[PDB]
Amino acid sequence: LDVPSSSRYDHRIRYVTYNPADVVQVDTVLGVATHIMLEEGEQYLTHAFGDSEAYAFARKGRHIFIKPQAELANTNLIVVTDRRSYKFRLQMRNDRNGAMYELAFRYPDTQARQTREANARAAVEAAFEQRVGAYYNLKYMMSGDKDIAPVNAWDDGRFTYFKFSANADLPSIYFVDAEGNESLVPRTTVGSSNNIIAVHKVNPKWMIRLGNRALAIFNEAYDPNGVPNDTGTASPAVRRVNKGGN
Amino acid sequence: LDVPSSSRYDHRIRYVTYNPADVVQVDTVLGVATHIMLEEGEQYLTHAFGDSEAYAFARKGRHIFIKPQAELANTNLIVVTDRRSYKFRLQMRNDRNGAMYELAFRYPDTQARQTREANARAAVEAAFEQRVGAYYNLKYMMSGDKDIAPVNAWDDGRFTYFKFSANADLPSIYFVDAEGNESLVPRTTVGSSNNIIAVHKVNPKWMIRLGNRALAIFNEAYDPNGVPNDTGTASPAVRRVNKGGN
């Protein structure tokens, strides 16, 4: 028997920590309506009374109202939602003292699970931001129309970064292969001021076009081997794991 | 007469382990509704009371609600389902003590079946990964556009593996016949970082193409006889057994 705990402001609002192997001791009185407060997103499925006509039951979504509609009602209420089952021991008070207006639940299990994802998301973000053990290639040379040129270009072994000044237009960057053909390469724009274009490849030669002006970028320390992507992410400290199961 | 065992938080929640050759003692006091819970996926077909008028019945999916609707309602409940068939011995406690709110079943049969299938899956997986009795051919030459070349090529007697570095685009690999004609060969991309292309055939010559660049691979130690596939799988330690019968 778990007794709902009254608030410090008024003894008439009560809280209980849900327990799948326990029953809530509901001390109802004459002529008051008790609000049972269910969890957000719970799909109410069924309720059952051990004495149905002793109590009045109405539901609106996740809100439960009960009220004693008969004399000497000592019965049980069990309401099953999509995730769990609730247990109640409805004992009426003869003296009509110390009623129950709202009964609210606390879920250690659900908030504890959510505590896990908050911690895990924080760990994932920290792992992306530490970027430990990265080697940077700076041997990049350029030749062409220098007015669309970056101020800095480098790669970390996985992506290639071109940094542009604030007064420059951000041009379009193309992947140049061995025979000289240009092809599309995906880009993401990073940096606090969005001044860096990160392309998702390391290549020996690059093409930068803007309007009718062209600039060629040459990686002068191209490493064919590179570093393998064993984790599924852009960081060695974050693993992409198969959730879908199936 | 399997008498269930109560929780510690409240006597009103009681558990019993299923058994197909025993019945469960259910105590149905006056004024309570008992929650009989079936396992997920279990399909209810029908049921039969010792007295239909004696007790109240209500099912919603896999949830059974019962309630004594008459005096001296001492009867039997037999509810049959897709998987199993339960057996209850309903008997009212005239003193309105020892009420039961839920009857939770623990099933050793499904547990044994899951443990058996999990063990079989683990054995099959271990046999696949062990790959003992494997002979490796490493006598491979190449001539052509070396920029799309593998860093390694070998074969194990059944499949040919081409390994590519991390900065290399994965090319398309074709099967070359005696007259020089290329044709498709089925492909699977394996390796921790998807760096190995495994083609499902051992052949003297291979064609690697990426764009307008081409590279020819030559198996210098081609073994026409190979290793016979008597088991139906890629491993000699895993059979492929005809389930369908018919």
Place this chain on the structure above:
Amino acid sequence: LDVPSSSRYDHRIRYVTYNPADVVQVDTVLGVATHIMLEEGEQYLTHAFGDSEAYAFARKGRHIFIKPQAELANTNLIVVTDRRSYKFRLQMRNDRNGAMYELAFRYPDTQARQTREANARAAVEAAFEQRVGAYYNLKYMMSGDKDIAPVNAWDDGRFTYFKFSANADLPSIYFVDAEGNESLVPRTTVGSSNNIIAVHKVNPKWMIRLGNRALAIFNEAYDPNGVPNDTGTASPAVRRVNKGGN
């Protein structure tokens, strides 16, 4: 009077062995439901009581429930199915003791029938396998494109077998007549690893084609006379008999 035998767990659960020559002694107490479970795939046809008014009957597929509905319920139940007709002696108990919840069966007739079919199939398979007194012609030559050649060719006087290595594509094999015309011959792939094409004919010459490569196969000990097919099967031990009668 086949008396069902109780289980070691609860007396209410009893087992009986079916017999086309004995009746089952069914003991019913008042206000309990007896579950008489039928066989798998067992198609219930009809039943018939001594008193439709002494026993309540409910059926759902292969599940049959009964209930005593009158005093001195001393009647008989005969439920007939396509496989078999059951038979029970229904005797109501005036003490409400020694109840029966389910009646579970065991079927010697079905397993006896199954063992005959298994024995017949096993005998036929043994006869197909034994293949005693077999002479094999091995004088086969070949000329043409040897890259598609078999590793072994022979015939047993009825079929011709070409064995191909593991790393070899299986080609298409054609019948060559006296004028040099090729025509389709039926084939079946045999061997543990599907390495052998058995063609259903013995011929002096064969042609093997794979793509644009051809290989001629010559039977250098061709027997025009062969071994007659007096049985109608591929083996002299198995006889094909006319079931259709008419």
Place this chain on the structure above:
Amino acid sequence: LTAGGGGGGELAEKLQPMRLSGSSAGRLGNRDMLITQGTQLDCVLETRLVTTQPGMTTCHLTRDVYSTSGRVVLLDRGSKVVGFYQGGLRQGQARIFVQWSRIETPSGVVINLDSPGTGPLGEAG
């Protein structure tokens, strides 16, 4: 015995959105008992083909076909595939559409693959 404003007509019609609904990724169930779309089955053509009259073709698999995981052989070598063509050629055409209908394993497995037959390098027809 038994119990019982409307204007801008051209420019506004050219500015109607094309709203393509997004997709959501799934996952294949058992990849050891599964051959997925786009797998190339290499077979050898048995019947000589002449497209005067509609007719049925036949070929046999030259090689084993493995599952999408590359671990289990799902279609054996020597499996008989049965197809058909119809309709003939038009002027300027040089390839006939062949649909393959069913494949029979040398051990009794039949699966209805109603697939397009192609050339040795995947060219249609």
Place this chain on the structure above:
Amino acid sequence: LTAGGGGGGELAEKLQPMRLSGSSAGRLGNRDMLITQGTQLDCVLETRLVTTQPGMTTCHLTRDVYSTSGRVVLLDRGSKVVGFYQGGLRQGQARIFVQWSRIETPSGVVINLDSPGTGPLGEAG
């Protein structure tokens, strides 16, 4: 056992307003598990293509494809894309419209991207 004035026709039709409804900006939910419209997937064509008959194409991703955030590999390299064309060319056309239908990841992920297939620089068909 069981329980239970109207004139100015030309000029006043040329002055009919074009009222185009405004838009409201939204936000992408998880930019780590999302590949958005206009991402360029670089694959390598496997089947040789001849547009005499309607057919089905196949290609494999040459590179890893990252999320919008550029932080997670969503489509691995070597993933098999399956497409199709139909209808053939008209006089004066030199490009066929190929639609790519599904992509299968080497780890078993399938997603229905029903996208236009383009050339190496995104020119349609």
Place this chain on the structure above:
Amino acid sequence: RLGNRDMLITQGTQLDCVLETRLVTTQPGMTTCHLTRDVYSTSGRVVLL
């Protein structure tokens, strides 16, 4: 799965027969031929035709 392979002839089986009637396609007509060889089952063990 095919049920009984010893009592089965499947699609794509080639039946070799020899034409009896001379064929001239001026008028619609009926042809006739006789099997030259025994035709076995898919298992290759029983002569079905």
Place this chain on the structure above:
Amino acid sequence: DRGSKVVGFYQGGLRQGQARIFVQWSRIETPSGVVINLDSPGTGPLGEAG
């Protein structure tokens, strides 16, 4: 922001005497995740239609 990816489409092709195709830009994506459906016309560098 700059680097925001804009996605459009064209259709129909040109007729004789035409030298500009009508492109409609459909949606834009900000490098920080903001997407707004702008179904605007695509023009040349000085606003000439198509």
Place this chain on the structure above:
Amino acid sequence: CASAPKPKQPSDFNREPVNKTVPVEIQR
């Protein structure tokens, strides 16, 4: 008078081993 071009044929002059070092997938 017109036949579809063939793909590039690789040159046969620079024939060299593919495996400069043994892979680690052989566990060597």
